[PDB]
Design an enzyme around this catalytic site. Structure first.
Site, PDB file in Angstrom:
ATOM      1  CB  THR A  98       3.917  26.106 -27.312  1.00 50.04           C
ATOM      2  OG1 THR A  98       4.458  24.856 -27.748  1.00 50.04           O
ATOM      3  CG2 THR A  98       4.907  26.788 -26.379  1.00 50.04           C
ATOM      4  CB  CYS A 151      10.138  25.140 -32.757  1.00 46.86           C
ATOM      5  SG  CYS A 151       8.976  23.873 -32.152  1.00 46.86           S
ATOM      6  CG  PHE A 194       7.599  27.791 -34.896  1.00 46.64           C
ATOM      7  CD1 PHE A 194       7.067  26.906 -33.977  1.00 46.64           C
ATOM      8  CD2 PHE A 194       6.779  28.288 -35.898  1.00 46.64           C
ATOM      9  CE1 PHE A 194       5.738  26.505 -34.057  1.00 46.64           C
ATOM     10  CE2 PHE A 194       5.453  27.894 -35.988  1.00 46.64           C
ATOM     11  CZ  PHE A 194       4.932  26.996 -35.063  1.00 46.64           C
TER      12      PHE A 194
HETATM   13  C1  HEM Z   1       3.843  20.538 -30.876  1.00 42.74           C
HETATM   14  C2  HEM Z   1       5.031  19.966 -30.715  1.00 42.74           C
HETATM   15  C3  HEM Z   1       6.295  20.750 -30.303  1.00 42.74           C
HETATM   16  C4  HEM Z   1       7.416  20.129 -29.938  1.00 42.74           C
HETATM   17  C5  HEM Z   1       7.593  18.590 -29.867  1.00 42.74           C
HETATM   18  C6  HEM Z   1       8.403  21.133 -29.617  1.00 42.74           C
HETATM   19  C7  HEM Z   1       9.690  20.899 -29.187  1.00 42.74           C
HETATM   20  C8  HEM Z   1      10.731  21.801 -29.196  1.00 42.74           C
HETATM   21  C9  HEM Z   1      12.126  21.486 -28.967  1.00 42.74           C
HETATM   22  C10 HEM Z   1      12.677  20.070 -28.663  1.00 42.74           C
HETATM   23  C11 HEM Z   1      12.822  22.624 -29.069  1.00 42.74           C
HETATM   24  C12 HEM Z   1      14.343  22.814 -28.912  1.00 42.74           C
HETATM   25  C13 HEM Z   1      14.981  22.371 -30.226  1.00 42.74           C
HETATM   26  C14 HEM Z   1      16.471  22.600 -30.220  1.00 42.74           C
HETATM   27  O1  HEM Z   1      16.941  23.582 -29.590  1.00 42.74           O
HETATM   28  O2  HEM Z   1      17.194  21.793 -30.857  1.00 42.74           O
HETATM   29  C15 HEM Z   1      11.897  23.700 -29.352  1.00 42.74           C
HETATM   30  C16 HEM Z   1      12.229  25.028 -29.525  1.00 42.74           C
HETATM   31  C17 HEM Z   1      11.319  26.057 -29.643  1.00 42.74           C
HETATM   32  N1  HEM Z   1       9.957  25.908 -29.803  1.00 42.74           N
HETATM   33 FE1  HEM Z   1       8.901  24.153 -29.904  1.00 42.74          FE
HETATM   34  N2  HEM Z   1       7.825  22.373 -29.813  1.00 42.74           N
HETATM   35  C18 HEM Z   1       6.522  22.190 -30.235  1.00 42.74           C
HETATM   36  C19 HEM Z   1       5.642  23.218 -30.526  1.00 42.74           C
HETATM   37  C20 HEM Z   1       5.930  24.574 -30.477  1.00 42.74           C
HETATM   38  C21 HEM Z   1       5.004  25.670 -30.693  1.00 42.74           C
HETATM   39  C22 HEM Z   1       3.502  25.483 -31.020  1.00 42.74           C
HETATM   40  C23 HEM Z   1       5.687  26.823 -30.558  1.00 42.74           C
HETATM   41  C24 HEM Z   1       5.222  28.296 -30.679  1.00 42.74           C
HETATM   42  C25 HEM Z   1       3.984  28.714 -30.416  1.00 42.74           C
HETATM   43  C26 HEM Z   1       7.057  26.496 -30.249  1.00 42.74           C
HETATM   44  C27 HEM Z   1       8.055  27.423 -30.044  1.00 42.74           C
HETATM   45  C28 HEM Z   1       9.393  27.162 -29.883  1.00 42.74           C
HETATM   46  C29 HEM Z   1      10.453  28.139 -29.765  1.00 42.74           C
HETATM   47  C30 HEM Z   1      10.270  29.672 -29.804  1.00 42.74           C
HETATM   48  C31 HEM Z   1      11.610  27.475 -29.631  1.00 42.74           C
HETATM   49  C32 HEM Z   1      13.012  28.093 -29.459  1.00 42.74           C
HETATM   50  C33 HEM Z   1      13.308  28.194 -27.963  1.00 42.74           C
HETATM   51  C34 HEM Z   1      14.603  28.934 -27.708  1.00 42.74           C
HETATM   52  O3  HEM Z   1      15.205  29.488 -28.665  1.00 42.74           O
HETATM   53  O4  HEM Z   1      15.041  28.977 -26.531  1.00 42.74           O
HETATM   54  N3  HEM Z   1       7.171  25.122 -30.213  1.00 42.74           N
HETATM   55  N4  HEM Z   1      10.628  23.160 -29.425  1.00 42.74           N
HETATM   56  O1  LIG Z   2      11.779  36.934 -20.591  1.00 41.49           O
HETATM   57  C1  LIG Z   2      11.730  35.808 -20.216  1.00 41.49           C
HETATM   58  C2  LIG Z   2      10.634  34.856 -20.722  1.00 41.49           C
HETATM   59  C3  LIG Z   2      11.165  33.708 -21.598  1.00 41.49           C
HETATM   60  C4  LIG Z   2      10.208  32.507 -21.620  1.00 41.49           C
HETATM   61  C5  LIG Z   2      10.457  31.481 -22.737  1.00 41.49           C
HETATM   62  C6  LIG Z   2       9.983  30.085 -22.308  1.00 41.49           C
HETATM   63  N1  LIG Z   2       9.913  29.089 -23.373  1.00 41.49           N
HETATM   64  C7  LIG Z   2      10.459  29.158 -24.578  1.00 41.49           C
HETATM   65  C8  LIG Z   2      10.133  27.981 -25.242  1.00 41.49           C
HETATM   66  N2  LIG Z   2       9.406  27.258 -24.406  1.00 41.49           N
HETATM   67  C9  LIG Z   2       9.278  27.933 -23.279  1.00 41.49           C
HETATM   68  N3  LIG Z   2      12.702  35.308 -19.255  1.00 41.49           N
HETATM   69  C10 LIG Z   2      13.791  36.091 -18.699  1.00 41.49           C
HETATM   70  C11 LIG Z   2      13.301  36.938 -17.525  1.00 41.49           C
HETATM   71  C12 LIG Z   2      14.419  37.626 -16.738  1.00 41.49           C
HETATM   72  C13 LIG Z   2      15.121  38.682 -17.302  1.00 41.49           C
HETATM   73  C14 LIG Z   2      16.131  39.312 -16.589  1.00 41.49           C
HETATM   74  C15 LIG Z   2      16.439  38.890 -15.303  1.00 41.49           C
HETATM   75  C16 LIG Z   2      15.737  37.837 -14.739  1.00 41.49           C
HETATM   76  C17 LIG Z   2      14.728  37.206 -15.454  1.00 41.49           C
HETATM   77  C18 LIG Z   2      14.778  35.057 -18.178  1.00 41.49           C
HETATM   78  O2  LIG Z   2      14.341  33.927 -17.833  1.00 41.49           O
HETATM   79  O3  LIG Z   2      16.005  35.318 -18.093  1.00 41.49           O
END
Ligand code: HEM
Ligand SMILES: O=C(CCCCCn1ccnc1)N[C@@H](Cc1ccccc1)C(=O)O
Ligand code: HEM
Ligand SMILES: O=C(CCCCCn1ccnc1)N[C@@H](Cc1ccccc1)C(=O)O
Lengths: 448, 448
Positions: free
Chosen positions: B261, B393, B386
């Site tokens: 990312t 994140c 994030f």
């Molecule tokens: C650069 C070092 C990074 C590390 C080590 C890292 C690691 C992680 C980890 C371990 C989590 C899960 C945390 C938890 O659920 O307790 C997480 C969640 C997430 N990260 Fe990062 N990340 C990084 C960078 C980024 C960047 C640059 C982005 C966005 C452009 C990003 C977007 C997200 C998002 C959206 C989630 C939530 C995922 C969800 O809700 O399923 N991360 N990250």
């Molecule tokens: O929209 C998405 C994309 C999500 C990608 C996020 C990946 N990420 C987040 C942090 N680092 C990686 N995913 C759905 C697609 C789907 C919808 C309905 C039925 C089948 C599949 C899913 O996987 O359920």
């Protein structure tokens, strides 16, 4: 092995005349600004150290090395608060006893029972403001003191101070202020026990008796409240309940500590809201979309996430209980460079800790609730508005629930105008208040 | 009580063939443009709802009503990342354990320790680019991936991937992309257990062994890094340390999440800078006046404010983690119009959320970093690159410091030329990257 700075001295009075000012905390803040994270403060018969950095304060908060000390301010409060929770030493039997008896009545689970009574007083506030005439203004710290004093009286003792029926403060609240003024004058007198100060003590001891009639009034009248748990609760450790004398000290303790610091927080919160309109808009929007009922529920208050961020950021800039004191349990070294002997005292200057640029960045003076958007990002012991450890504020959840509910209702029901362009003036008792803070509130005409 | 729109269906396959494309996120964005702030998406055995407006997503971010869900993509990542931080449920014991143990390693004190290692990798990038011959170009996402992977390997595990010494990506990285491709081909299959996919599954288990042995390589060698705090840190809550099984999952988790990312973000940032020359000029000027030393300091990186706004504005238009998933903890109503039952899942379509014209105005498609000057001016939950809440994140500050440091050194040391007039082509894995983006860099001849 560093030599500790010390501010200017006054001969045999040492640093004591530096406290002969009506804004001592702000004066101490300026000294730390000049001298840094630690400085020695000396008085005849007294030496302490004021800590200002999270680096040192995180060590002072180690409960294995430092315990709560009774500052001179707390020793003066002890003269009528006795061995109540706030002014007892940790090793006094009555502290842990009353602590064990009283934590159940301050849990988050306990807040659900207080909530209805908190709404009772909060509704009285909203109706007062909605009943103002055009171009009448609000005296904010005065009305917040009406609210928090009434709330602790109702929730704690099922007693109605009925502050909103009064234009002038209760004699109980006026007497306190007279006592503290005499307390701070006694410091700068070389001979306080002079035959010539009987007139000073003559009126001073009357106020101590003034409070005891209210306590008898409160006890004899006597529900699931604070006063109940004191008469029927038993300490699991010793199996004993509190005795009648200590019960009286707790009632005095909770009446003071239970309202003054919380009205300061609310007053500072509203001040920062009207000085930062973007934050106000953000907070009012959350209050509008969350408080969908004419009366807020307990669960709705927990949903006021941004309102709580507002309150925490107000607590960061102006923590209304601005200091607490500690003593060294054994010989130890502070910061690997400041040796302390057993019994040496420390002061934690909370407003300076909260301005540590190595913790908060360079914009420490800006009001930005977004610092508290993720609570986990805050390092340990960087944010201590409620004290530390087992001697931390027992009323923390009570205060924050009351203040979140009240501020949320204020934001939902009124638009606020800083019509005088208020210049912040921080009045200092033992706590902090924005003196003279006034606003105009225009009702949004949403019924209750 | 509104009836929810839904895109075109394919008989018994429901909406699933709509994802049979190499740009599914952009395809979902196009559906959101046609159907609005919410639409239902159905697949055999699965129903979800895609949210696109800040109005609904601010409700979805209420942690009392919605918890993090494992999307199908995350469940497939879970097949080799196990109960690591990213792919565990919030109620799984190892999530909070590892969260409590690992949050210290992303504190400001830990960023200060990582800074030198980040500079080590950033200098290798600057040297590679200054060592190019005339009319040679830069493959931007490829070099940004070299940098971010080397940075997480060094800062997290004291391990050197030495990507700048390699002409093709590491086999560990080639297997990853091949594994995901099979995952997205497995999504469209009616009969996944059909013997005709035995050859497909044979490589999936081979690639898992490829990654786990790289983990062995990192393990066998083993400082102030993530791996230290995983082997010696133990949770304050339970007093327990992570066991060997979970440690392996966190290493896998941080290797992927720690770089992909972030290289997307850097690549999009440089793309937007060279397409908006006035913004490039302003960012280059700030880089020149703040980065006065041959090596940026930690404090100098926090001072690159406009570079940080550039990074935030790139994250608004193309959040490289384009979605996250939630499920309803109880029966609830969304927006006063869409009733949800307990367990119903939601998808937050982040690139669409960030294009909400009622939040950002009508010029949502323009690159303007000045949108992020005041965070208090941004409505609540309008900007979610994030994630949200306690499942946000954990590497956020790590990513922003690395990208600000690297972007600042790039702007200080080179002028950049979009010599092909690159047409943005967004490649989609589980994240977003600008495919084929190339520039020319003319050194400013400033020594290191
Ligand atoms: C650069 C070092 C990074 C590390 C080590 C890292 C690691 C992680 C980890 C371990 C989590 C899960 C945390 C938890 O659920 O307790 C997480 C969640 C997430 N990260 Fe990062 N990340 C990084 C960078 C980024 C960047 C640059 C982005 C966005 C452009 C990003 C977007 C997200 C998002 C959206 C989630 C939530 C995922 C969800 O809700 O399923 N991360 N990250
Ligand atoms: O929209 C998405 C994309 C999500 C990608 C996020 C990946 N990420 C987040 C942090 N680092 C990686 N995913 C759905 C697609 C789907 C919808 C309905 C039925 C089948 C599949 C899913 O996987 O359920
Ligand atoms: C609103 C209801 C409140 C009540 C009933 C209350 C009561 C108390 C009590 C009884 C103690 C001593 C507990 C012990 O040592 O066992 C205490 C400690 C403390 N409280 Fe409060 N309080 C309230 C609000 C607040 C607020 C709003 C603040 C901060 C702005 C605050 C700051 C503190 C501090 C700093 C201490 C520690 C004092 C020291 O270490 O000497 N309190 N409180
Ligand atoms: O700094 C302070 C302010 C502390 C007041 C806190 C009172 N509070 C706490 C919670 N709710 C009320 N007090 C010192 C001043 C002093 C220093 C040296 C010599 C004489 C006096 C003291 O009392 O010792």
């Amino acid at each position: 092995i560093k030599e500790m700075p010390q501010p200017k001295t006054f001969g045999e009075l040492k640093n004591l005349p530096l406290l002969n000012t009506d804004k001592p905390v702000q004066a101490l803040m300026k000294i730390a600004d000049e001298l840094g994270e630690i400085f020695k403060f000396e008085a005849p018969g007294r030496v302490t150290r004021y800590l200002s950095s999270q680096r040192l304060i995180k060590e002072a908060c180690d409960e294995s090395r430092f315990d709560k000390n009774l500052s001179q301010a707390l020793k003066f409060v002890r003269d009528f608060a006795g061995d109540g929770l706030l002014t007892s030493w940790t090793h006094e039997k009555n502290w842990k006893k009353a602590h064990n008896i009283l934590l159940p009545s301050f849990s988050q689970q306990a807040m659900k029972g207080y909530h209805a009574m908190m709404v009772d007083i909060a509704v009285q506030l909203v109706q007062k403001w909605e009943r103002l005439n055009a171009d009448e203004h609000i005296e904010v710290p005065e009305d917040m003191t009406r609210l928090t004093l009434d709330t602790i009286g109702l929730c704690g003792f099922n007693y109605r101070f009925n502050s909103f029926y009064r234009d002038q403060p209760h004699p109980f609240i006026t007497s306190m202020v007279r006592a503290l003024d005499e307390a701070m004058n006694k410091l700068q007198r070389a001979n306080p026990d002079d035959p010539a100060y009987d007139e000073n003590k003559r009126q001073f001891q009357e106020d101590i008796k003034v409070m005891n009639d209210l306590v008898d009034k409160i006890i004899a009248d006597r529900s699931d409240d604070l006063l109940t748990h004191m008469l029927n609760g038993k300490d699991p450790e010793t199996g004993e309940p509190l005795d009648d004398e200590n019960i009286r000290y707790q009632i005095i303790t909770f009446l003071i500590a239970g309202h003054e610091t919380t009205s300061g927080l609310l007053s500072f919160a509203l001040y920062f809201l009207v000085k930062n309109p973007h934050v106000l808009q953000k907070a009012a929007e959350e209050a509008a979309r969350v408080l969908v009922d004419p009366v807020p529920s307990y669960k709705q208050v927990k949903q006021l996430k941004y309102v709580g961020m507002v309150l925490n950021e107000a607590l960061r800039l102006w923590p209304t209980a601005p200091a607490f004191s500690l003593y060294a349990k054994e010989d130890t070294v502070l910061g690997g460079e400041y040796p302390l002997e057993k019994g040496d005292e420390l002061m934690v200057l909370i407003p300076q800790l909260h301005r540590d640029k190595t913790i908060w960045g360079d914009d420490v003076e800006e009001f930005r609730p977004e610092r508290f958007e993720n609570p986990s990002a805050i390092p340990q012991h960087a944010f201590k508005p409620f004290g530390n450890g087992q001697r931390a504020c027992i009323g923390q959840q009570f205060a924050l629930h009351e203040a979140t509910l009240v501020l949320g209702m204020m934001l939902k029901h009124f638009d606020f105008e800083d019509h005088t362009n208020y210049e912040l003036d921080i009045k200092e008792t033992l706590t902090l208040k924005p003196e003279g803070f006034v606003v105009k509130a225009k009702s949004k005409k949403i019924p209750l």
